[PDB]
């Protein structure tokens, strides 16, 4: 089959092929009227470009403070990525970490760090061993950590990562943070998604599950750098939002008879909500405990 | 307001000079500038080089293909055949082919031990755009060159220079033209080193192959000199020994670099391109 | 060597310092919210807290009435102290006033503060509020707190 | 007097070729005859030099100097001028490229001293100049590292020749 | 002074004189006045000297333009591209001839300070000196106070 | 880039909890060293 | 600046009117084609006769060709900013409209084809001797393909495309000073029908700010 | 004492442009969540404080009208009411100040 280096190249070309395909559907530069319904600067109307302008571009019209503070956008009462192009006239609201009820933002950050960890895991092991990403479980933030289900090669059945191995994952994740790669989002049909992830059995089942729920059978694809994954919802704009990041521990899920599923875990905090050294150690201890989704 | 005119006039010229420095005019062809006679300059071109050029051939050498097409376009725009002007493509091909053969003959006789790979790169270097254009600009070839775009592109100028040689080849012959190539292209290797002109990769690998052709055992690299090994400014002299006999030695800041330098020194001695080699004989042939 | 000195040096002297604080204190009682330079408000804040304590002694106390007579230059505020402010803080043992820093004064760029008696009828000051318990950092700590209590019971 | 700064917004560049890169929008604005000292205005102009348009306003708003309000007012009317007149899409996509103060025309007044002597005081005036360039602010120059110092030193040692000889 | 002026190393144009000698002077442009009193020597040079000078320098194109001018000048252009303008204002015929001949003999390089009165691309034949040139070698290349086979 | 302190982002409920948490840990750590001779002391 | 100094014999000489004497409302659905009619024609004929009085050698049929040449040359002056020639082609009411918004911008306008021949839709004249001057306005219907490409002060594309012509249907109003012996027919203004399709959208995005509320004020729906 | 020599601009630039004499960039600036205007972390928002002061000034003017002169401080508590509001059970026996405007959203009735 395809080598891991070639596998990413095929996915990126297919991902870019669909992205440019959707761009051509836009007739010239059609204008849309985006009304700001937030508490601050009420009544502001943005005359943006359909399928081209993003909520971040709307924030650039207001000030730099909106660009830095806004993590997620609320379009017609629905979560919206900051870099997801707007498709119609709508009402926009900007959400931050320090809102009264930042429930959607917390889900987006947790869904974003899980993807970042998933990128680290795939490129961490040597080419001799096979790594298959299963999914990113939707665990609550109050659980103390975000988790990612990973199935490794059969050779790594009796092997558990050491403390130095866990620190190796943390350094790789911090390199991803340093790169400051924006989260590129793209909503595609189920058929396109299956072709991209045709080499992985777990993703195909995951994509089919997402497509079945939606009447139009459309799934959301997110990419940072060269890593493409299927996400349950909107993500943070850029990887630079994360400030403290660390992979806590790895646990083997049960039963192991059909297949050995390993659950990587970690805890992260953004720049806006960075904690003290003493407090950060306390959160690390809780993140190492196994988390069970309910 | 002081009386006078000379002081005000003198200051105006100073202001004009400063304005030119602040906003330099774009360069223009010497032909467009005043005091230019193309026919007079063509004749002086041959006399400076002490060559009996043919005026009919020499003028066609400076006529480029782009200039002819641009001239035809201008006539169509103005709605104005008399433009049956021959380009320099034929002369350039003759000049380029002769120059490569002439340079190959000179280098083969001067360095019989140099392989065909080394000779070809030296000929390509001498006929390269960087060397040819440098000679062409300083021989007033660029001023006489008729081109659509100014300054003349290096690709176009190189073609013009070889057209001049081609015109000289028909005017005087191969014997006279060889001296012209010797006096202006061979001279370009005066201070240049062998590997500064012939760029190579992994000289040690090439050295081993050369010794096999000469039935010589593989060289052995050893440290002959060493200074400041544990410091930030080391010195190493790596010597290459064949049958426990020194063939070359080279300095370097690291053992790997010094060993690579020694391979280059060995290649120079084998190929005859030593720094203290016999200088080129520019004297008149007997 | 101002080691252990707890009283600021303001006004034209010691007596002028008391009169300056008394005018601020008298203005504070009448309007229940005044603004002044930060140092003077901080110096006056201690006296405002102790003035309410004298009000809790009752108007029948001669010493309390004498203290209220001196510090309230407008005699209509003396009934207000013993019948409005003092009954207001009957169930409070302290913290009668809140002091907050406002932007600097426009004229001399002086550090300005606003001091008010808690429970006044005026519109509330924009008090600083801590981050909501639903933030990402607070949710993680809440989960940690729940884990410890569960382990303690077990 | 000279008013060359106001004339720098009247330069019309030729249209760009389709392959040419986007040219950042340059906006020149200034305020003449400010009742302030150019020496005191220099520190405020130096403070916001290189900052973004929004960060410069934030720093000036909470600065106790009198010229901070004056400079902030100049930036506010320059920021609006960029979008309204100079075809800038996002009003926040600007940074302070140039910002400096210059001496203006001043008036001389007499100050009376003792013993019948006097000194001449000047009513100082200053000009504030600002240049706005469209785009994110340029990143600050990283500090010189030990690798850069060592590389530069070795290059110095490798460039020295035998002097006063052949 | 030397510090306040630029400097260069001694050099030639296209290694002139190595294979053959090429006259670096390429063009001379004279500007004489028909009636100008300061151009009297310039007119004398044109009448009898420039014609013979052109015979001796077939490779130099000389342009003589007679136009009204207060200060006659001669412009010398060289193969390397340098342009030098010299005034012949109120100069005798002999002084002009010396100046014109001086321009023909120059290579066209900048007339500034030359650091070394010599130039060589091969300064060494036997090998440039290095600290180990006169240092003998020791058996097995042992450094001072070094023990072999410990 | 802005500076921060330990209880800047803590909520009203968390501040008493964090103070109690760190204070209890400090007392536990100090109480754990009360028997130096039972924790492999160096030779006397 | 509104009024010159009072009690002066010299008065400002205007070379054109400020507006349209009687606005011509085009019929709805006229673009799809690409009793009252007689009354409008009769009114137009009366104004034509008065025009022919001052200029006997005047023909209505030749005007649309003449109007087309004036329209093309007037807009071509904007490409090279030839304001000297533009004044001879447009009136003083039309000159500020054409040139005020393009002073620091580069305009590349071209004429491609004429889809339909120009038709004169209305010829009318002002009231006789308003101030000793009589003006005549002619409205010409033009349906031609044009190419526009406006660049901003920095040479960046701002509006339109340089190689894609589009259909334009506009009603150009011309005006001439009949009393002036040296007067000539010049463009006066344009009529924009209410039913005209909206123009092509601009390239950049624009933010429309909301009301700026004082602290005492509050936002209302 | 008088200067012995004139200090050069090179010497003066070093003193004037020293980092100790340069303005320090502030890092405690944040956006006020209520109005979106800037504020310092330890300082009340200027826009919001002005909003409260504007309403406070109107209330105090209405207080003076009821008092109708100096030395008229009441011996009972005060309650501010707006249009469409009536006194509550806990507001009985307290001085009532009426404002001819709708109650502000940020001014919660107690
Ligand atoms: Mg003290
Ligand atoms: Mg004092
Ligand atoms: Mg003075
Ligand atoms: Zn606020």
Swiss-Prot record, chain D:
Q: Which GO terms describe its cellular component?
A: mitochondrial inner membrane; mitochondrial large ribosomal subunit; mitochondrion
The superkingdom of the source organism is Eukaryota
Q: Which GO terms describe its biological process?
A: mitochondrial translation; translation
Q: Where in the cell is it found?
A: Mitochondrion
The transmembrane segments are none
Keyword hit for Mitochondrion: yes
GO molecular function, a single term: RNA binding
Keyword annotations for this protein?
A: Mitochondrion, Ribonucleoprotein, Ribosomal protein, Transit peptide
Q: Which family does it belong to?
A: Belongs to the universal ribosomal protein uL22 family.
Q: How does it assemble?
A: Component of the mitochondrial large ribosomal subunit (mt-LSU). Mature mammalian 55S mitochondrial ribosomes consist of a small (28S) and a large (39S) subunit. The 28S small subunit contains a 12S ribosomal RNA (12S mt-rRNA) and 30 different proteins. The 39S large subunit contains a 16S rRNA (16S mt-rRNA), a copy of mitochondrial valine transfer RNA (mt-tRNA(Val)), which plays an integral structural role, and 52 different proteins.
- Name-wise, this protein is Large ribosomal subunit protein uL22m
Give the organism's phylogenetic lineage: Eukaryota, Metazoa, Chordata, Craniata, Vertebrata
The gene name on file is MRPL22
Q: Which residues of the full protein are shown?
A: 41 to 206 of 206
Swiss-Prot record, chain E:
Tissue/organ expression: High relative levels in skeletal muscle and testis. Lower levels of expression in the heart, brain, placenta, lung, liver, kidney, pancreas, spleen, thymus, prostate, ovary, small intestine, colon and leukocytes. Expression is coregulated with TWNK.
| One of the record's GO molecular function terms | RNA binding
- Output this protein's name: Large ribosomal subunit protein mL43
- Cellular location(s): Mitochondrion
Would the keyword Ribosomal protein be found if you checked this record's keyword annotation?
A: yes
Q: Quaternary arrangement and interactors, per the entry? A: Component of the mitochondrial large ribosomal subunit (mt-LSU). Mature mammalian 55S mitochondrial ribosomes consist of a small (28S) and a large (39S) subunit. The 28S small subunit contains a 12S ribosomal RNA (12S mt-rRNA) and 30 different proteins. The 39S large subunit contains a 16S rRNA (16S mt-rRNA), a copy of mitochondrial valine transfer RNA (mt-tRNA(Val)), which plays an integral structural role, and 52 different proteins.
CC terms in the record's Gene Ontology section: mitochondrial inner membrane; mitochondrial large ribosomal subunit; mitochondrial ribosome; mitochondrion
Q: Which family does it belong to?
A: Belongs to the mitochondrion-specific ribosomal protein mL43 family.
Curated annotation (Swiss-Prot), chain F:
- This protein is called Large ribosomal subunit protein uL3m
Q: Which organism is it from?
A: Homo sapiens (Human)
Cysteines paired by S-S bonds: none
The annotated subunit structure for this chain is: Component of the mitochondrial large ribosomal subunit (mt-LSU). Mature mammalian 55S mitochondrial ribosomes consist of a small (28S) and a large (39S) subunit. The 28S small subunit contains a 12S ribosomal RNA (12S mt-rRNA) and 30 different proteins. The 39S large subunit contains a 16S rRNA (16S mt-rRNA), a copy of mitochondrial valine transfer RNA (mt-tRNA(Val)), which plays an integral structural role, and 52 different proteins.
Where would you find this protein in the cell? Mitochondrion
Species lineage: Eukaryota, Metazoa, Chordata, Craniata, Vertebrata
Q: Which gene encodes it?
A: MRPL3
Family per UniProt?
Belongs to the universal ribosomal protein uL3 family.
Q: Which disease is it linked to?
A: Combined oxidative phosphorylation deficiency 9: A mitochondrial disease characterized by failure to thrive, poor feeding, hypertrophic cardiomyopathy, hepatomegaly, and psychomotor retardation. Death in infancy has been observed in some cases.
Swiss-Prot record, chain H:
Q: What does this protein do?
A: Component of the mitochondrial large ribosomal subunit (mt-LSU). The mitochondrial ribosome (mitoribosome) is a large ribonucleoprotein complex responsible for the synthesis of proteins inside mitochondria.
What does the record give under GO molecular function? RNA binding; structural constituent of ribosome
Q: How does it assemble?
A: Component of the mitochondrial large ribosomal subunit (mt-LSU). Mature mammalian 55S mitochondrial ribosomes consist of a small (28S) and a large (39S) subunit. The 28S small subunit contains a 12S ribosomal RNA (12S mt-rRNA) and 30 different proteins. The 39S large subunit contains a 16S rRNA (16S mt-rRNA), a copy of mitochondrial valine transfer RNA (mt-tRNA(Val)), which plays an integral structural role, and 52 different proteins. bL32m has a zinc binding site.
The organism sits in which domain of life?
A: Eukaryota
The name of this protein is: Large ribosomal subunit protein bL32m
Span list, region Disordered: 86-110
Q: Which gene encodes it?
A: MRPL32
In which residues is Zn(2+) bound? 32, 35, 45, 48
Could you state one GO biological process linked to this protein?
Answer: mitochondrial translation
Query: Where is the protein localized?
Result: Mitochondrion
**What is the protein's major site of localization?**
mitochondrion
Q: Give GO cellular component annotations, separated by semicolons.
A: mitochondrial inner membrane; mitochondrial large ribosomal subunit; mitochondrial matrix; mitochondrial ribosome; mitochondrion
Query: Keyword Ribonucleoprotein on this protein?
Result: yes
Q: What is the organism of origin for this protein?
A: Homo sapiens
Compositionally biased intervals (Basic and acidic residues): 91-103
Which keywords does this Swiss-Prot/TrEMBL entry list? Mitochondrion, Ribonucleoprotein, Ribosomal protein, Transit peptide
Entry similarity comment: Belongs to the bacterial ribosomal protein bL32 family.
């Amino acid at each position: 089959q395809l080598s891991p280096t070639e596998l990413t190249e095929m996915r990126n070309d297919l991902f870019n092929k669909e992205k440019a395909r959707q761009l051509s559907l836009t007739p010239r530069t059609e204008k849309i009227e985006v009304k700001h319904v937030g508490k601050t600067d009420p009544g502001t109307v943005f005359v943006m470009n359909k399928n081209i302008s993003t909520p971040y571009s709307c924030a650039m019209h207001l000030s730099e403070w909106y660009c830095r503070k806004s993590i997620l956008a609320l379009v017609d009462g629905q979560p919206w990525d900051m870099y997801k192009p707007l498709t119609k006239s709508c009402e926009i609201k900007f959400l931050t970490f320090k809102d009264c009820d930042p429930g959607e933002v917390n889900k987006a950050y947790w869904r974003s760090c899980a993807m970042m960890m998933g990128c680290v895991i795939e490129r961490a092991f040597k080419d001799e061993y096979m790594v298959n990403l299963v999914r990113a479980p939707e665990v609550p933030v109050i659980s103390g950590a975000f988790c990612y289900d990973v199935v490794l090669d059969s050779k790594l059945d009796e092997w558990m990562p050491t403390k130095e191995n866990l620190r190796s994952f943390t350094k790789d994740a911090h390199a991803l943070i340093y790169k400051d790669l924006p989260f590129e989002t793209l909503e595609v049909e189920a058929k396109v998604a299956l072709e991209i992830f045709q080499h992985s059995k777990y993703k195909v089942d995951f994509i089919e599950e997402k497509a079945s729920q939606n009447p139009e059978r459309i799934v959301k694809l997110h990419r940072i750098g060269d890593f493409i994954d299927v996400s349950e919802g909107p993500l943070i704009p850029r990887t630079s939002i994360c400030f403290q990041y660390e992979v806590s521990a790895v646990h083997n899920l049960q039963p192991t008879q059909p297949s050995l599923i390993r659950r990587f875990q970690g805890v992260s905090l953004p720049v806006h909500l960075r904690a003290h050294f003493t407090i950060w150690d306390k959160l690390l201890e809780r993140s190492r405990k196994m988390v069970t989704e309910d | 307001v002081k009386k006078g005119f000379r002081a005000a006039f003198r200051f105006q010229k100073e202001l004009e000079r400063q304005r030119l420095l602040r906003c330099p005019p774009p360069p223009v062809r010497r032909s467009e500038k005043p005091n230019w006679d193309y026919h007079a300059e063509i004749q002086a071109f041959g006399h400076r080089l002490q060559e009996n050029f043919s005026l009919d051939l020499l003028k066609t050498a400076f006529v480029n293909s782009c200039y002819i097409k641009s001239e035809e376009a201008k006539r169509q725009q103005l709605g104005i055949v008399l433009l049956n002007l021959k380009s320099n493509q034929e002369l350039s091909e003759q000049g380029t082919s002769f120059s490569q053969t002439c340079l190959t003959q000179f280098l083969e006789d001067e360095y019989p031990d140099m392989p065909t790979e080394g000779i070809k790169n030296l000929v390509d270097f001498l006929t390269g755009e960087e060397v040819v254009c440098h000679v062409a600009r300083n021989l007033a070839v660029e001023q006489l060159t008729l081109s659509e775009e100014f300054p003349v592109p290096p690709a176009v100028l190189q073609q013009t220079f070889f057209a001049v040689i081609g015109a000289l080849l028909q005017s005087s012959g191969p014997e006279r033209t060889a001296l012209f190539i010797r006096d202006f292209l061979i001279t370009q290797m005066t201070g240049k080193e062998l590997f500064e002109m012939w760029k190579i990769i992994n000289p040690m690998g090439l050295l081993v192959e050369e010794l096999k052709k000469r039935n010589v055992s593989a060289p052995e690299s050893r440290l002959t000199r060493q200074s400041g090994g544990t410091t930030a400014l080391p010195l190493y002299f790596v010597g290459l020994y064949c049958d426990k006999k020194l063939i070359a030695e080279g300095p370097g800041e690291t053992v790997l670099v010094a060993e690579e330098e020694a391979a280059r020194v060995a290649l120079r001695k084998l190929y005859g391109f030593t720094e203290n080699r016999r200088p080129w004989n520019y004297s008149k042939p007997k | 060597i101002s080691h252990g000195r707890v009283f600021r040096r303001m006004g034209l002297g010691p007596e002028s310092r008391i009169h300056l604080l008394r005018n601020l204190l008298t203005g504070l009682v009448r309007h229940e919210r005044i603004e002044a330079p930060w140092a003077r408000v901080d110096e006056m804040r201690g006296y405002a807290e102790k003035l309410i304590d004298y009000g809790k002694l009752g108007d029948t106390n001669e010493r309390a009435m004498r203290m209220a007579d001196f510090w309230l230059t407008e005699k209509d505020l003396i009934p207000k102290l013993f019948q409005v402010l003092a009954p207001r803080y009957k169930d409070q043992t302290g913290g009668y006033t809140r002091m907050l820093q406002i932007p600097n004064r426009s004229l001399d760029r002086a550090k300005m503060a606003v001091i008010e008696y808690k429970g006044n009828c005026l519109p509330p000051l924009p008090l600083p509020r801590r981050d909501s318990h639903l933030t990402l950092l607070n949710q993680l700590l809440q989960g940690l707190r729940q884990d410890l209590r569960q382990s303690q019971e077990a | 007097i000279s008013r060359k700064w106001e004339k720098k917004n009247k330069i019309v560049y030729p249209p760009q070729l389709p392959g040419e890169p986007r040219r950042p929008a340059e906006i020149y604005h200034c305020r003449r005859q400010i009742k302030y000292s150019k020496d005191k205005m220099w520190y405020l102009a130096k403070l916001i030099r290189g900052m973004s348009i929004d960060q410069a306003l934030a720093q000036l708003e909470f600065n106790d100097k009198k010229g901070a309000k004056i400079i902030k007012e100049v930036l506010l009317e320059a920021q609006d001028m960029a979008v309204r007149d100079h075809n800038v899409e996002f009003r926040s996509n600007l940074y302070i490229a140039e910002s400096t103060s210059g001496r203006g025309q001043c008036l001389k007044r007499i100050r009376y001293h003792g013993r019948g002597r006097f000194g001449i005081m000047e009513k100082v005036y200053c000009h504030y100049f600002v240049k706005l360039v469209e785009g994110p602010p340029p990143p600050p120059e990283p500090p010189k590292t030990a690798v850069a110092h060592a590389k530069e030193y070795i290059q110095q040692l490798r460039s020295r020749t035998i002097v006063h000889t052949l | 002074t030397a510090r306040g002026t630029p400097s260069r190393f001694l050099a030639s144009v296209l290694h002139n004189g190595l294979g053959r000698y090429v006259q670096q002077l390429q063009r001379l442009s004279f500007s004489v006045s028909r009636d100008g009193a300061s151009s009297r020597g310039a007119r004398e040079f044109v009448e009898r000297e420039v014609i013979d000078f052109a015979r001796r320098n077939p490779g130099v194109v000389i342009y003589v333009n007679s136009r009204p001018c207060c200060v006659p000048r001669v412009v010398a252009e060289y193969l390397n591209g340098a342009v030098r303008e010299e005034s012949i204002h109120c100069k005798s015929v002999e002084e002009i001839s010396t100046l014109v001949q001086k321009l023909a003999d120059q290579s066209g390089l900048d007339v500034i300070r030359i650091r070394k009165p010599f130039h060589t691309d091969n300064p060494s034949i036997q090998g440039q000196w290095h600290p180990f040139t006169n240092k003998p070698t020791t058996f097995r290349g042992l450094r001072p106070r070094e023990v072999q086979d410990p | 880039k802005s500076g921060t302190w330990w209880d800047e982002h803590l909520s009203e409920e968390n501040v008493p909890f964090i103070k109690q948490l760190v204070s209890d840990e400090d007392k536990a750590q100090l109480a754990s060293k009360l028997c130096p001779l039972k924790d492999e002391p160096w030779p006397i | 600046l509104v009024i010159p100094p009072e009690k002066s014999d010299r008065s400002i000489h205007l070379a054109c009117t400020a507006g349209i004497f009687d606005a011509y409302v085009p019929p709805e659905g006229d673009a799809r084609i690409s009793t009252e009619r007689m009354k409008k024609t009769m009114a137009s004929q009366v104004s034509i006769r008065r025009i022919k009085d001052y200029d006997a050698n005047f023909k209505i049929k030749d005007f649309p060709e003449k109007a087309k040449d004036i329209f093309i040359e007037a807009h071509l002056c904007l490409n090279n900013s030839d304001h000297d020639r533009l004044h001879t082609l447009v009136t003083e009411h039309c000159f500020p409209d054409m040139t005020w918004d393009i002073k620091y911008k580069t305009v590349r306008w071209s004429f491609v084809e004429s889809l339909e021949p120009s038709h004169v839709v209305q010829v009318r004249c002002s009231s006789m001797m308003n101030q000793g001057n009589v003006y005549g306005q002619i409205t010409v219907r033009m349906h031609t393909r044009q190419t526009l490409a406006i660049y901003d002060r920095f040479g960046r594309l701002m509006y339109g495309q340089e190689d894609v012509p589009k259909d334009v249907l506009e009603y150009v109003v011309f005006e001439k000073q009949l009393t002036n012996p040296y007067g000539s027919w010049r463009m006066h203004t344009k009529i924009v029908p209410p039913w005209a399709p909206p123009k092509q959208p601009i390239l950049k995005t624009v933010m429309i700010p909301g009301p700026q509320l004082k602290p005492e004020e509050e936002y209302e729906e | 004492a008088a200067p012995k020599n004139r200090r050069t601009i090179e010497v003066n630039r070093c003193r004037r442009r020293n980092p100790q004499k340069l303005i320090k960039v502030k890092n405690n600036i944040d956006v006020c969540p209520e109005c979106g205007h800037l504020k310092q972390k330890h300082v009340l928002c200027a826009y919001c404080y002005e909003k409260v002061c504007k309403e406070t000034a109107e209330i105090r003017r209405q207080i003076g009208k009821q008092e109708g002169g100096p030395f008229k401080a009441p011996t009972i508590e005060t309650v501010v009411l707006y249009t469409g509001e009536t006194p509550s059970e806990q507001d009985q026996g307290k001085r009532i100040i009426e404002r001819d405007r709708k109650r502000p959203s940020w001014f919660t009735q107690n």
